[PDB]
Amino acid sequence: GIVEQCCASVCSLYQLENYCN
Amino acid sequence: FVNQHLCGSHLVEALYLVCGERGFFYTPKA
Ligand SMILES: [Cu+2]
């Protein structure tokens, strides 16, 4: 998931927007 | 904006910045 991708790989701020309420 | 390497609490900080008052869910894997 995102927690994992952001740490083991990289992620974008736009991908993080998917976790906002 | 640039790509991010974010582990632990640093990811929580990023979500807070991105989502602001909308709030967010922090949902790691089991
Ligand atoms: Cu640190």
From Swiss-Prot, chain A:
Superkingdom, natural source: Eukaryota
Membrane-traversing stretches: none
Cysteines engaged in disulfide bonds, as pairs: C6-C11
Protein name: Insulin A chain
Organism (species): Bos taurus
Gene name for this UniProt entry: INS
Residue range from the parent sequence: 85 to 105 of 105
